[PDB]
Ligand binder design. Structure first.
Ligand SMILES: N=C(N)NCCC[C@H](N)C(=O)NCCCNCCCNCCCCCNC(=O)[C@H](CC(N)=O)NC(=O)Cc1ccc(O)cc1O
Ligand SMILES: N[C@@H](CCC(=O)O)C(=O)O
Ligand SMILES: N[C@@H](CCC(=O)O)C(=O)O
Lengths: 231, 88, 86, 132, 49, 98
């Protein structure tokens, strides 16, 4: 199996619903809200000539703009020409942004999963970025030596052509190397080792991809002794 | 002449061309052309909307100003017939 | 073959909000808007029979306002109030 | 008076944003309007005057990336806030003199409104060309 | 300032509601009565040999 | 494929394992998957209703595509780089001037 450093995923915060807009946009919309409502007030109460005929004031205007913004309707409408011609602009302003909001929240509420890097070791043969090695005096290392599958052959070519040594001397040495490499040195070991390292703290490692073959542990005796068949 | 045909028949040319052009896909778009990022809306996307908003504000304010300018100091039912005939 | 440089990624311009619909469709929208407003004005104010003309509040300018308001999802205050304009 | 004071301070200012950049070629940046001044380095407080000069694919008259830059590195909309704001301050100061015409102070608030409108446009274009 | 908060609530709620409604009305998942058998011990209904 | 054809001989002599299995299926055919001429195979695929594919060369393929009734379709990419040429009897004087 292949063991690499687990990428640190981001957790959604408390205010994770204001996400599909940026804080600049959120302040600009507030500024524009204030400006539109006060301009509507100015055009409303302007001594038309009698004076208390129109119904708009600062306060009426302040929540008129809001009830126009969120689709809740209103109670009254501008009746002067210029009041109508500014309210139409505010209507056109909301129809873009709130549609953008819903349509993008639909995008945020589909996927949260990471794109899953160098999987199935073929890009370990293809790229030259992330290094990888094995355990010295090891059956895996001898397996890549004697291997005849061409992708494994190129992997063995890269491993023997290494600057510096991609190999290590012990398992925990390679463990610490991958825990410090920051996504730059992959490691190869056996699946049982891999899952045991996964089930420990700090859990910063991660198994990727599938398996490669079917090995097996067994009991070893000197050739021909009497212990063989009873064991 | 015979040897090159042996190579073309057995696909060694294909294998070597793959080794020296396609296994070394390194820079950018070949590797990262089939990935996905979701979004995050920035202000640089939406700026003309704000521009239209502020311009409409100024236009409306100008309209009210000239309305008050007029009412500080159609026509001839009759020649409306002239206007509609020439319009037709 | 011809080799030139890389170009730079041209980000979308100012008038990019109206992009997902075609210009011809926008034109037909404007024409239909004007036509619907005018036809509704014609249906009202048609000697309704001392209120024999001011039965409705739909002026030409009011009908214009009504169509624009109904298009962008905020209904105005008035309502058609009679058959065949509705 | 407080609005005029805060606007003149905010214009006469080298501290708006903080990013990572350089001080003077050919680092946490104490960046402002045109003096992209800096700190926390080999030297602290050498304020380079900035303008526009990219090394692009030679955009000829790409308007949204050229005329925008022209409005950016010549703050006309931000400075016009100061202009209209002191103009309205002059009218509200001239409220007392030449009075009893009940028309002059109507003209005053128009400047304050339009100055705010110039301010919001300037903020938009500054954030735009920061991200440009 | 109750009502506008209530409006903000209704916007953020139902926009989240109507995100992917159509996926939730054609699902057709399976049932899988037993897996680790042990009801082959418990019940008497389904035979096994 | 087309009988007495270079493609058919190519799948015979081919050593890539997928092509080997394809040749295995083609030689183990009930009935004959081969044809005697190009238009024969054309009509067979035009009547097979998505049940009999065909193999030929890309120029033939695009010429069949650019004709009526356009009910055919090229799928996938290529497989190799063949080439048409002029053929002479071995050793005649026409070789180098041609
Ligand atoms: N004379 C005396 N004495 N008294 C007389 C006094 C009389 C008095 N003046 C009087 O009569 N007053 C009457 C005033 C009545 N006016 C009430 C009018 C209110 N109408 C408000 C209607 C607003 C409808 C808003 N609709 C929306 O927001 C819609 C609905 C929705 N899906 O949520 N929004 C959307 O669809 C968004 C949306 C669309 C598509 C999509 O895929 C996803 C989305 O989120
Ligand atoms: N069981 C293996 C572990 C090392 C390896 O897989 O290379 C051995 O003793 O050789
Ligand atoms: N040019 C080829 C066509 C048939 C084939 O590709 O098998 C030949 O003459 O053999």
């Amino acid at each position: 199996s292949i063991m690499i450093k687990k990428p640190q995923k981001s957790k959604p915060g408390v205010f994770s619903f204001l996400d599909p807009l940026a804080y600049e946009i959120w302040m600009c919309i507030v500024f524009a809200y204030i400006g539109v409502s006060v301009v509507l007030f100015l055009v409303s109460r302007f001594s038309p000539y009698s004076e208390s005929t129109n119904e708009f004031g600062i306060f009426n205007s302040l929540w008129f703009s809001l009830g126009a913004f969120m689709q809740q309707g209103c109670d009254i409408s501008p009746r002067s020409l210029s009041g109508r011609i500014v309210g139409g602009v505010w209507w056109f302003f909301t129809l873009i942004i709130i549609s953008s909001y819903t349509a993008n929240l639909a995008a945020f509420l589909t996927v949260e999963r990471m794109v899953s890097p160098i999987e199935s070791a073929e890009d370990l043969s293809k790229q030259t970025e992330i290094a990888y090695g094995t355990l010295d005096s090891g059956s895996t290392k001898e397996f890549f030596r004697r291997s005849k599958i061409a992708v494994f052959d190129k992997m063995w070519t890269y491993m023997r052509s290494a600057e510096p040594s991609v190999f290590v001397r012990t398992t925990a040495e390679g463990v610490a190397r991958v825990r410090k490499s920051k996504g730059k040195y992959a490691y190869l070991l056996e699946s049982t080792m891999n899952e045991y390292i996964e089930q420990r703290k700090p859990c910063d490692t991660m198994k990727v991809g599938g398996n490669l073959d079917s090995k097996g542990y067994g009991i070893a005796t000197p050739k021909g002794s009497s212990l063989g068949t009873p064991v | 002449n015979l040897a090159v045909l042996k190579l073309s028949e057995q696909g060694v040319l294909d294998k070597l061309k793959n080794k020296w052009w396609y296994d070394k896909g390194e820079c950018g778009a070949k590797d990262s052309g089939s990935k996905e990022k979701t979004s995050a809306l920035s202000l640089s996307n939406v700026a003309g909307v704000f521009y239209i908003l502020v311009g409409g504000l100024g236009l409306a304010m100008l309209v009210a100003l000239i309305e008050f300018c007029y009412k500080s100091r159609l026509f001839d039912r009759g020649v409306q017939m002239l206007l509609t005939t020439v319009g037709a | 073959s011809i080799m030139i440089k890389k170009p730079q990624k041209s980000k979308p311009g100012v008038f990019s909000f109206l992009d997902p619909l075609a210009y011809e469709i926008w034109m037909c929208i404007v024409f239909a808007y004007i036509g619907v407003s005018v036809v509704l004005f014609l249906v009202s104010r048609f000697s309704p029979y001392q209120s024999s003309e001011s039965t409705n509040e739909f002026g030409i300018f009011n009908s214009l306002w009504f169509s624009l308001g109904a298009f962008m999802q905020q209904g105005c205050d008035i309502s058609p109030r009679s058959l065949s304009g509705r | 008076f407080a609005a005029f004071s805060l606007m003149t301070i905010a214009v006469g200012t080298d501290y708006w944003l903080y990013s990572r950049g350089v001080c003077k070629t050919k680092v946490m940046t104490h960046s402002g309007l045109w003096r992209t001044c800096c700190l926390e380095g080999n030297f602290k407080g050498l304020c380079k005057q900035i303008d526009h000069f990219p090394e692009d694919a030679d955009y000829e008259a790409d308007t949204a990336e050229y005329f925008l830059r022209a409005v950016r590195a010549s703050s006309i909309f931000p400075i016009l806030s100061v202009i209209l704001l002191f103009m309205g301050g002059l009218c509200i100061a001239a409220s007392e003199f030449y009075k009893t015409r009940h028309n002059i102070i109507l003209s005053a608030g128009i400047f304050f409104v339009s100055a705010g409108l110039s301010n919001i446009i300037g903020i938009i274009v500054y954030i735009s060309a920061n991200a440009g």
